[PDB]
């Protein structure tokens, strides 16, 4: 049930998240685009400084009034094929170099931590206050800087499949925001798109998003969702922790199979007033796919001895998840102290650097960084025993991969439905059926993906916002409106891209999308979308 205090907590968390996102965008522009800075910041340094900025801003608000506050999703920066989970610690740089020596150059940006021109850099971060969560994620593009022009600008737009993915993600974000705002004024929904007396459904959400992805020649990556957020239950760890009640729309390999053929999420819900919704969309480019295939995910481990593949990424995840249903008294004192701090954190994913007493640093000093690393080594000693007894788990690093359908059809699985990975640590993905109609399990699909020579990786673009449906009473101006807690035209401003595709106007769904864009651009007699503003810094 919404209230003024709940709305204020959401607004404060959203403002903190917007300010942090603006900070990291400015840092990237200064390091790579403005090029005024002497030293180029790398990915782990960006993540660490972002988390410190979030904590220092959050210290000033809701002191001695709220039991729990902090970082909801640790600052993640993902590059091209890497679809999420990339928040490396600062003490893993030499490890990454040593592990990936003798590999390809395909993951060079993530291995080195230095960005390169043409990279799709996805920034994701979230803030929770009293369990009320706001999350934001934006894709930006790294361009080469022009020299002849007086003013620092890119030499050209981003072109190709990466541009297609960025455009698909951005347009899907805008259309979904408009559609969910139409739930407050159902009479404003375009007639062709849906009924005047009909509400907003997950079916309509899915078909609009699929129409846009199909128009831009992209797939929807299986981690995408448009779900409802409640207190302490935001899907901060959706692939790891289970939930009793779920209201939203997801995309999976099973949904891809059903589309090609034509606690459990389902698109049989009506978007109601007075609720908070998270919209997270990942679009994978299908530029290099000359056939029809399936979009899946490959998990990253830290073992270089598991194969001889040159284009494999070896890395260790930086974010851990505490399982409060598991109890075990540890044998190491360092382990017991670390567990005490981890239980102090909460039900959100955490970094080991977040647990240091020095962090966040008041003054960015070489000795402060050194003291943080000194704490980090002992933290790793404790963490090994904590994870060896299943008290914490790793939130995975995932890469979007493409598997053609002919290989899946020709492949033979003697076990069918019955096969499942019994060595998997997590129960939720271990007991998974990506293809219920074909009887192909997760371990079988991973085997097929690894056996294929035409199983390539796909660049991914990401857009993720949080919105609240404010009623006539809750809103200021006595009319219902959509309050966007994060994202919009101030922070998630699109990069310079150009695509060869566009929505073909001879489609009813496309016409409905265009009518929604018209009603959004109208501010008098249309939709009311109020964007949350970042606070000032200097």
């Amino acid at each position: 049930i919404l209230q003024e205090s709940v709305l204020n907590k959401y607004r404060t968390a959203g403002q903190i998240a917007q300010t942090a996102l603006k900070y990291v965008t400015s840092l990237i522009n200064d390091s790579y685009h403005s090029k005024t800075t002497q030293r180029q910041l790398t990915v782990p340094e960006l993540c660490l400084l972002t988390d410190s900025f979030i904590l220092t801003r959050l210290e000033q608000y809701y002191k001695n009034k709220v039991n729990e506050r902090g970082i909801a999703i640790p600052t993640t920066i993902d590059i091209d094929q890497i679809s999420g989970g990339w928040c490396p610690e600062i003490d893993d740089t030499q490890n990454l170099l040593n592990w990936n020596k003798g590999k390809d150059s395909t993951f060079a940006s993530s291995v080195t931590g230095t960005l390169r021109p043409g990279d799709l850099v996805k920034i994701t971060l979230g803030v929770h206050i009293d369990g009320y969560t706001s999350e934001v994620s934006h894709t930006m593009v790294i361009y080469p800087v022009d020299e002849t022009k007086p003013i620092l600008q890119p030499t050209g737009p981003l072109l190709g499949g990466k541009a297609d993915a960025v455009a698909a993600a951005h347009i899907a974000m805008e259309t979904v925001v408009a559609l969910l705002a139409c739930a407050l004024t159902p009479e404003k929904l375009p007639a062709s798109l849906g009924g005047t007396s009909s509400g907003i459904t997950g079916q309509l959400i899915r078909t609009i998003v699929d129409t846009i992805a199909r128009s831009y020649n992209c797939g929807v990556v299986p981690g995408s969702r448009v779900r409802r957020i409640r207190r302490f239950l935001a899907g901060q760890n959706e692939g790891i922790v289970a939930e009793r009640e779920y209201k939203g729309v997801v995309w999976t390999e099973s949904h891809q199979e059903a589309d090609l053929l034509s606690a459990i999420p389902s698109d049989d819900f009506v978007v109601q007033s007075g609720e908070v919704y998270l919209i997270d969309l990942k679009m994978a480019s299908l530029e290099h796919c000359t056939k029809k295939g399936l979009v899946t995910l490959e998990t990253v481990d830290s073992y270089t001895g598991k194969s001889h593949k040159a284009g494999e990424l070896i890395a260790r995840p930086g974010a851990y998840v505490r399982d409060f249903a598991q109890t075990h008294i540890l044998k190491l004192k360092t382990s017991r102290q670390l567990l005490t701090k981890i239980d102090k954190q909460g039900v959100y994913p955490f970094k080991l650097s977040h647990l240091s007493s020095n962090f966040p640093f008041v003054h960015e000093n070489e000795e402060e960084l050194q003291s943080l690393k000194k704490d980090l080594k002992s933290f790793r000693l404790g963490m090994s025993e904590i994870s060896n007894n299943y008290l914490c788990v790793e939130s995975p690093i995932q890469i979007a991969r493409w598997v053609p359908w002919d290989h899946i059809l020709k492949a033979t699985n003697p076990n069918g439905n019955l096969s499942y990975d019994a060595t998997s640590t997590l129960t939720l993905p271990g007991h998974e059926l990506p293809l219920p109609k074909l009887g192909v399990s997760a371990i079988k699909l991973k085997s097929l993906m690894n056996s294929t020579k035409e199983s390539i990786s796909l660049p991914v673009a990401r857009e993720c916002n949080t919105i609240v449906l404010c009623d006539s009473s809750v809103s200021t101006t006595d009319r219902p409106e959509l309050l966007r807690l994060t994202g919009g035209s101030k922070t998630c401003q699109p990069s310079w891209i150009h695509s060869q595709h566009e929505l073909n106007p001879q489609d009813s769904i496309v016409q409905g999308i265009f009518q929604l864009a018209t009603l959004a651009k109208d501010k008098r007699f249309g939709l009311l979308l109020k964007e949350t503003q970042p606070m000032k810094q200097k």
């Binding site: 965008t25 522009n29 685009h33 403005s34 930006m140 361009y143 620092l152 600008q153 890119p154 737009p157 960025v166 455009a167 951005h170 090609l260 053929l261 056939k291 029809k292 359908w405 002919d406 059809l409 109609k437 074909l438 009887g439 401003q493 699109p494 990069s495 310079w496 891209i497 150009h498 695509s499 060869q500 595709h501 566009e502």
Partner: peptide, 26 residues
């Protein structure tokens, strides 16, 4: 056979542009 029919159905099935942003750094 439902598996046979699903496999044959899948076999039968598989058998200006736009601009965003501009020359400036957001």
């Amino acid at each position: 056979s439902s598996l046979t029919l699903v496999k044959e159905a899948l076999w039968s099935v598989i058998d200006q542009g736009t601009t965003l942003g501009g020359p400036f750094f957001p």
